[PDB]
Design a protein around this ligand. Sequence first.
Ligand SMILES: [Ca+2]
Length: 559
Amino acid sequence: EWWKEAVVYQIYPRSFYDANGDGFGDLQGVIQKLDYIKNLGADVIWLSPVFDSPQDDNGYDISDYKNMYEKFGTNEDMFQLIDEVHKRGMKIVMDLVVNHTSDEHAWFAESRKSKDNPYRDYYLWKDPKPDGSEPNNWGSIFSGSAWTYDEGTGQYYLHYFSKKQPDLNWENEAVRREVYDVMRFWMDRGVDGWRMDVIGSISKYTDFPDYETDHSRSYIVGRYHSNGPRLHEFIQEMNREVLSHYDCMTVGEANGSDIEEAKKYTDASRQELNMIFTFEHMDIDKEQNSPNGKWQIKPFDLIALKKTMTRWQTGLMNVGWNTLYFENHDQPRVISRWGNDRKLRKECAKAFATVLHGMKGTPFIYQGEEIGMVNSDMPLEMYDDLEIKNAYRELVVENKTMSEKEFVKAVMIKGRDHARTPMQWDAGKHAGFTAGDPWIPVNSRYQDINVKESLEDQDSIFFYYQKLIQLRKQYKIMIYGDYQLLQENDPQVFSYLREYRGEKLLVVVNLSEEKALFEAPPELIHERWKVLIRNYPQERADLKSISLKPYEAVMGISI
Ligand SMILES: [Ca+2]
């Protein structure tokens, strides 16, 4: 169970390092930066998808599972990367994207040709309604209908994501076998595990029932879009046929997951996955179900964060396993989203890191999180993401459920592209990401926020992350201790306790810009503490009462 003790670094490779000058990050670029990742201390890398793809969704629309997209390199480069990871004592996890393929995948190019094609039933085709409209009212995550009509055959195909991402038909045993063959091809060549993209969607309600509607919207995304009736059957089959034959790690991107679903995926006795990503803690700052979805912003609410993260810590405390993340290629920079990214940027970045890394589970560090990368001020016309383009058209232009100004404000907070501007290596041109022209501009603050300056500054966010990772490797309590929320009603302070074999770990973090007070509960007042990490310089170990400075974070271990 090395995956319980791991710290994972997520690379978004088109934006990590461009070794050959075309402005697009590449596999040889990753290889050249592996020493940096090892020095940080992560021991597992998760690479976002590098398989051949027309890039409609930046690699999540795969047109060939057994070849690389040419700008990343060739399979030879990928095999070298695997070897280079292993030579450093690290592991590599690839992105398994098997809810859907590109519409340019050979399977779909064949499927769409005719009802008698042998690939027809690789995808999900249905007749129009009598009036020619879509089979039901289901929506795409990327706006509009989940169905697209094919004039040549007279049927619609299903796509939960873009029209260039047709969903695979997992009811067809041949599709499942194709998926297992892909997994074995890569695992036999040294891939150590998989991050499984929208694994929650692979089983459909094959009666395709309409949702109920209150007429706020024409197309609906809801409970049928995940947790289908055969979901866990399929994952159990995948474990029997593939995962059980390798020393591997699996993490599912479990869209639609709540704590009970997480137990189904992650209880070891069920022989499914090791861990899942949930969205519940990322969902605290949207309204529950507006037509504008995640663009219907709410302010950061620490109480909501504490409630949600505590539900997950206690729910998987003695069964299953948690992932721990605040950032990925789909989320904004957490310090910009929920904190201070200006005068208190360092303290705030370190504070969020401490809250997260003090918990039970496997931490994930998204590229640039460890240097305090921030959201971008770029104008809307500079964004790339199809999610944004499609939502602008639907919400602002067509349906008018958001004004222009409100949509721009929402994108500046939550746009996926805040995660995707290039990694900031130094203060030179394009932050040292490329000698050419980057595929999207580097964030305008890069001259102040970059690896070079971080390694020169002993007070950097980088060295704080490096220390959190070292502590996890030294103190078994951080991996295996239980969890108890402390001072639960405090609106500024996120404090909790871990316990393991008579030892205690106290984590106290002021997630606010104002002064706060932590007082230990009565059962803890006679403990003696050794401070393991703090993001301010004043040092005292009487943690029973702490007058917390803005964004102050501290972890102590009992002695
Ligand atoms: Ca390149």
